[PDB]
Amino acid sequence: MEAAHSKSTEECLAYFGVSETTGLTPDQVKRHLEKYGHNELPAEEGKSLWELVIEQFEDLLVRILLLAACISFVLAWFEEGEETITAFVEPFVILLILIANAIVGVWQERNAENAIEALKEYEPEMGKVYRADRKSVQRIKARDIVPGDIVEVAVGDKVPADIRILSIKSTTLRVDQSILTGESVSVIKHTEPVPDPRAVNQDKKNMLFSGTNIAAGKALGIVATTGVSTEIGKIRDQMAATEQDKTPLQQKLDEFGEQLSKVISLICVAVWLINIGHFNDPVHGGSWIRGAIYYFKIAVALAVAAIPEGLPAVITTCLALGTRRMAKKNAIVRSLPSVETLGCTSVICSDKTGTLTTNQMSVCKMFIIDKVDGDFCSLNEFSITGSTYAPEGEVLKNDKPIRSGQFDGLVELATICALCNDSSLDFNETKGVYEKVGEATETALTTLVEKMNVFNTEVRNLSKVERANACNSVIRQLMKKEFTLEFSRDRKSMSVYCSPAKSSRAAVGNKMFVKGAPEGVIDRCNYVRVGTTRVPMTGPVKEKILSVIKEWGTGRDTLRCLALATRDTPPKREEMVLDDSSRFMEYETDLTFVGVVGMLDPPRKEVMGSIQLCRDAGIRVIMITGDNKGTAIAICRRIGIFGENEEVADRAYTGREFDDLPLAEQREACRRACCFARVEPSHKSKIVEYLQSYDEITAMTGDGVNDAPALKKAEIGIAMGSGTAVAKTASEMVLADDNFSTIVAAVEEGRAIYNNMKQFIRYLISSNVGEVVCIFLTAALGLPEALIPVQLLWVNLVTDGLPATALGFNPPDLDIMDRPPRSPKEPLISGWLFFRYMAIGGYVGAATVGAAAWWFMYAEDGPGVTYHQLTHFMQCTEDHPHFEGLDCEIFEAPEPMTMALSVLVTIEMCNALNSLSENQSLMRMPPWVNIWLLGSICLSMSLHFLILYVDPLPMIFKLKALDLTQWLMVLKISLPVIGLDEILKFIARNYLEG
Numbered sequence: 001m002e003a004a005h006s007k008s009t010e011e012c013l014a015y016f017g018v019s020e021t022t023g024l025t026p027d028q029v030k031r032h033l034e035k036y037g038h039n040e041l042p043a044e045e046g047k048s049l050w051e052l053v054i055e056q057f058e059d060l061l062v063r064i065l066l067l068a069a070c071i072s073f074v075l076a077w078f079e080e081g082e083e084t085i086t087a088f089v090e091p092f093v094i095l096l097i098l099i100a101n102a103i104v105g106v107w108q109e110r111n112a113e114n115a116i117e118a119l120k121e122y123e124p125e126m127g128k129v130y131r132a133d134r135k136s137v138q139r140i141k142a143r144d145i146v147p148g149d150i151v152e153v154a155v156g157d158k159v160p161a162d163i164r165i166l167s168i169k170s171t172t173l174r175v176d177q178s179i180l181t182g183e184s185v186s187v188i189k190h191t192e193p194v195p196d197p198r199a200v201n202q203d204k205k206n207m208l209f210s211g212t213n214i215a216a217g218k219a220l221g222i223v224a225t226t227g228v229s230t231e232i233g234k235i236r237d238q239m240a241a242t243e244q245d246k247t248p249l250q251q252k253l254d255e256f257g258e259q260l261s262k263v264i265s266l267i268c269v270a271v272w273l274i275n276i277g278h279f280n281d282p283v284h285g286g287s288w289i290r291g292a293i294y295y296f297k298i299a300v301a302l303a304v305a306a307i308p309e310g311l312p313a314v315i316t317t318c319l320a321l322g323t324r325r326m327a328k329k330n331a332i333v334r335s336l337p338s339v340e341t342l343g344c345t346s347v348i349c350s351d352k353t354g355t356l357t358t359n360q361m362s363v364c365k366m367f368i369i370d371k372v373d374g375d376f377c378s379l380n381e382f383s384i385t386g387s388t389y390a391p392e393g394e395v396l397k398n399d400k401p402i403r404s405g406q407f408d409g410l411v412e413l414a415t416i417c418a419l420c421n422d423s424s425l426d427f428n429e430t431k432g433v434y435e436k437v438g439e440a441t442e443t444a445l446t447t448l449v450e451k452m453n454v455f456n457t458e459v460r461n462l463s464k465v466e467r468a469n470a471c472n473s474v475i476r477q478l479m480k481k482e483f484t485l486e487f488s489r490d491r492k493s494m495s496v497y498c499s500p501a502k503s504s505r506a507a508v509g510n511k512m513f514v515k516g517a518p519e520g521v522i523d524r525c526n527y528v529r530v531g532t533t534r535v536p537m538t539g540p541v542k543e544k545i546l547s548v549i550k551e552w553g554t555g556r557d558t559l560r561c562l563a564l565a566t567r568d569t570p571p572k573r574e575e576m577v578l579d580d581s582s583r584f585m586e587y588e589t590d591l592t593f594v595g596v597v598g599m600l601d602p603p604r605k606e607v608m609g610s611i612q613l614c615r616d617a618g619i620r621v622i623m624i625t626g627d628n629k630g631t632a633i634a635i636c637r638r639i640g641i642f643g644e645n646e647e648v649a650d651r652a653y654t655g656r657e658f659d660d661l662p663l664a665e666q667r668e669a670c671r672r673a674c675c676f677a678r679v680e681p682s683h684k685s686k687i688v689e690y691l692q693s694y695d696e697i698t699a700m701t702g703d704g705v706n707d708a709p710a711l712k713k714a715e716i717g718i719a720m721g722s723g724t725a726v727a728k729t730a731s732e733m734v735l736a737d738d739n740f741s742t743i744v745a746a747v748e749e750g751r752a753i754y755n756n757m758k759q760f761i762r763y764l765i766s767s768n769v770g771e772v773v774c775i776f777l778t779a780a781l782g783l784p785e786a787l788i789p790v791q792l793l794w795v796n797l798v799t800d801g802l803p804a805t806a807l808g809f810n811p812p813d814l815d816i817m818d819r820p821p822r823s824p825k826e827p828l829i830s831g832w833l834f835f836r837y838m839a840i841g842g843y844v845g846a847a848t849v850g851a852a853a854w855w856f857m858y859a860e861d862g863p864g865v866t867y868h869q870l871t872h873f874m875q876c877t878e879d880h881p882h883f884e885g886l887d888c889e890i891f892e893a894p895e896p897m898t899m900a901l902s903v904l905v906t907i908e909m910c911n912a913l914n915s916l917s918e919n920q921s922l923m924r925m926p927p928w929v930n931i932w933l934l935g936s937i938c939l940s941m942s943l944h945f946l947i948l949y950v951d952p953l954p955m956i957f958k959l960k961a962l963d964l965t966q967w968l969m970v971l972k973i974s975l976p977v978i979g980l981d982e983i984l985k986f987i988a989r990n991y992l993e994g
């Protein structure tokens, strides 16, 4: 029964066919349980296993690198040399990274909590039911409960299923629907049906939702829906169906992997096409097995050279170090990738109360009728000082302090604010200030009564605690609070029936003090108070009332007006039906207007600049609020979303308006709307869908379970620190101080990280491009091997990894918030940037190959050899006469490879300094700016010397120590890379920037 709220209690019993006295018979229990199933959310199966590891080896590059290990393992065993430990190193280190890199991607254990599992914390273990097999109540497992069950609930009990209330045994039934609404105010429930079939959960005043817990009272009802059919269940299915996309950066890296695979695959074919001349060679010239060793040992080098093996470790360390910066700036980021995509935030949908405002409600102004006479009419405006819940303030008229007690209208003003009020004040000694108890709205009225002091009570003699509820208690001495008519969205008001104490205070029997929305209350007023006297509600007077209320709400004050009226001749205690919530409005009729009070929910102290900060950053800010369209717009103009004097008729909508628009115009409205008032529960996720349709990175925010689906669907889900756990687990970010400013502050960090992140990405890729050119040059020309795959890995992992990680601490390029958001489909390298690192990669390739060729030919300690015979090193044993000087092992010498490797390492240290800034010259930007970079460079070169000195290492890397004689040549060939890059930077700023 999904529409059980609209059906009467007799109808729900008739549908399921169950007796309220007996309950479901064990036969029915078997039938209902086998039909509707168990009352429990589906166990989130489809979890990770060994398959999660398989997913890491699904891409193309990972298979190419894996293939490099298999081919390497084949060539590892096949060798004549009697070397032991160095045998299984090439295929060993590959698995080390392939395993390590896979573990990083599989790392979704500690860096990501489950949202649906946190949602299962609301469904209780056991629940009470009345079955036909027994007489007394019997508690069973909540899962065993089925639709049609006659369940029982009391105070403290957690509601097991969506229950249609049948009978309330206690005096009044209160439930804390904080998770399914947000307001901590325990709403009062009733038994009568709600006529609207598609009414919102907040309107269903005869339903107990699962997950909710009874704050007070005891009642019995029939179970309407269970499992996924409940309100919690329907929210769960929305989250389960919602698929989260991957950050635009992640899509670029997956895209780069596909491109890099074609590059490796193309070069492998290119290398084979260059050696197509071997077709025109004798079969007795040698063995094909010797040529196959070259083809296989080359391909493995290509895979290792092209791939940036250290990249994943570099970003994981950077983003982890970026997470700590987020936490310090009040921003608990969930996942690692979230810190980067945060900078690409183009839209920020935020809630007004709590986030944009301080939630420190306080009455600022208030007016009453001065006197009425024909067409003439005059009011009596006042102003209250002290934007806080503390009574430390005063009342003044026209910027002059006055005694509130001297106005009879103000006396009843404070009377209604004190009586018609369930909240109160409470002084906290630990904090050292006055705290609120209940609603922010009602507590402000409590504070107002304390400031006014209409009956002139002693205040200086009182203590700090007695001062809390002094004036309010004095009011309670006069009138007795008989009963209160609960607040409802149908009439938008609240009244309280009151009887005078035994003292004869000139009271006309009993009274009703109304409090609620202006337009609703003023219309039901047929009379108007004038201090002590009363006059009929005339036209001219009603104009002045709504005009001032219009001025306060629409004006710069942006006040939440609240009309206060009183019923002088209310119906008798017997005639009033206390259970019928619909008749409450009729009871609140024929009222006498007393006065209006205007309160303000003060905007955040820093939102003025944060909003303006988004204006420059090109980020669109949309406000979601519960205020009316008129005031919501006025508030938007105040904080900065709107200008003080611009047109915003189509740039702002209500829940009613937006819902009435067609599907096409709803999407058209979301691309220009910057304010949504009176928003429906499901409208949050709708707006996200329309925003996502324009390929726009959205940042929706919430706090309760209602917003979970919207947060889950949004790219950047934002939750509050004071929000529920489900909102936190579903969101990508959690605001520590619940501030809109900390969102923008985090977004600014997101762009700063992405700039530094994108920088070392081009740095590593630049090195990988050079390693491919080094291999292709030494292979195509037919030269001896310049670099070994075991060497290239240690270069990408350590020597390039350390500085690349140190590049994450690069100084933030100022004026970053001046530029617009990073485009989702923006390439990492393109145009001039591609040519820039292409030339840099092109030079290092020739430098490393030339460095090795230097030792083979024009060397000091090396042999005096020429180029034409150096390319024919594979024919050393064959063509004996042409090659004669020393052993053939000299072609496979460690010296020339040490030169090629030293030149590669030295240049990357210089290229790391080139990566300090993208275009800013090293003359402008000092190389010693980033201290962590210099520390990493010193550590890298220290490790470079380590693999040459400490004997155990160089034997494995196939290297031999170089003296000062050989190191000089390395610096001569390496250092020129800075000058070349300096020229490219100079060309970029001059003949490009325009």
Ligand SMILES: C/C=C/C/C(C)=C\[C@H]1C/C=C/C=C/C[C@H](C)/C=C(\C)[C@@H](OC)C/C=C/[C@@H](O[C@@H]2O[C@H](CO)[C@@H](O)[C@H](OC)[C@H]2O)CC(=O)O1
Pocket: 055, 056, 058, 059, 061, 062, 065, 101, 102, 104, 105, 106, 249, 250, 251, 253, 254, 256, 257, 260, 307, 308, 309, 310, 311, 312, 315, 316, 319, 336, 337
């Ligand atoms: C981009 C932000 C990601 C967050 C993060 C915490 C970790 C990321 C950092 C990403 C590095 C990418 C490098 C590209 C390069 C060509 C590939 C190599 C060296 C690869 O080695 C050949 C290593 C890849 C390891 C990472 O693998 C993940 O594999 C998944 C399945 O295909 C993809 O969905 C992820 O796409 C972004 C991808 O990152 C381990 C990992 O999670 O690392």
Ligand code: NA
Pocket: 244, 711, 712, 713, 714, 715, 716, 717, 730, 731, 732
């Ligand atoms: Na999400």
